Amino acid sequence: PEHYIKHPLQNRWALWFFKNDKSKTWQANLRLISKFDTVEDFWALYNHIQLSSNLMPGCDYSLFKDGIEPMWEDEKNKRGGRWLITLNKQQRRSDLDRFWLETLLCLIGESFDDYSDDVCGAVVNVRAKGDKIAIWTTECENRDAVTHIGRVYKERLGLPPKIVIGYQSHADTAKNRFVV
Numbered sequence: 001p002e003h004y005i006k007h008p009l010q011n012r013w014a015l016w017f018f019k020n021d022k023s024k025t026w027q028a029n030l031r032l033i034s035k036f037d038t039v040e041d042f043w044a045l046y047n048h049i050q051l052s053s054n055l056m057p058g059c060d061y062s063l064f065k066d067g068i069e070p071m072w073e074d075e076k077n078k079r080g081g082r083w084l085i086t087l088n089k090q091q092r093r094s095d096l097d098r099f100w101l102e103t104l105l106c107l108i109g110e111s112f113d114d115y116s117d118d119v120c121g122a123v124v125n126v127r128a129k130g131d132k133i134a135i136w137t138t139e140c141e142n143r144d145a146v147t148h149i150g151r152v153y154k155e156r157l158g159l160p161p162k163i164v165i166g167y168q169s170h171a172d173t174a175k176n177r178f179v180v
């Protein structure tokens with residue numbers, strides 16, 4: 001079988017694109033690119049789309065589980081939050097692509113052990129004032145789930161102990177609940 005069957009992923013994922021157009025509302029600028037649920041289809045999609053290094057400022061990439069929209073209003077997002085990573089212009093050249101791909105691999109590979117059910121998706125923001133990468137979780141009050149994801153994430157990215165990342169509730173964003 002392995003010689004001809006695609007390798008299924010634990011979850012089905014949806015990749016979203018966002019471009020900032022002042023003529024439209026924020027929700028109207030969200031566009032769904034494609035959905036995938038196999039290892040082969042992910043790499044086909046990833047190799048066909050632009051790297052975030054080469055996106056114009058004001059655009060976003062979002063990878064979310066099928067059934068969860070890239071909105072904080074979503075049922076699985078309103079009571080949750082995100083682990084935030086801030087990038088300067090030097091990091092856009094050095095780390096932007098590596099961190100986003102590692103983020104994608106942490107989602108589709110289910111790298112967070114039992115707490116991978118609390119992951120909702122990931123977002124990279126390409127802005128002129130600085131780039132951001134976030135992993136969204138479903139419940140901000142689950143200290144065990146949120147902090148374990150933060151520890152696994154920070155080690156996966158290779159961040160040194162001198163750097164600290166913060167987790168912010170989406171309700172507050174519209175302060176850091178935890179830091180790791």
Ligand SMILES: Cc1cccc(Cn2c[n+]([C@@H]3O[C@H](COP(=O)(O)OP(=O)(O)OP(=O)(O)OC[C@H]4O[C@@H](n5cnc6c(=O)[nH]c(N)nc65)[C@H](O)[C@@H]4O)[C@@H](O)[C@H]3O)c3nc(N)[nH]c(=O)c32)c1
Nearest residue numbers: 020021022023024025026029070071072073127170173174
């Ligand atoms: C809570 C949360 C947590 C994490 C992520 C999100 C994502 N999110 C973001 N928004 C809305 O989008 C506004 C600006 O977004 P941000 O405040 O995050 O600012 P950014 O850094 O993203 O962008 P920018 O600094 O380069 O801004 C540059 C200039 O463009 C204006 N602008 C930005 N976009 C649009 C747009 O789409 N059309 C128009 N005409 N102008 C826009 C900005 O105002 C500024 O004048 C924000 O207030 C909200 O209304 C959301 N809305 C709902 N309902 N749900 C969400 O989940 C959500 C939300």
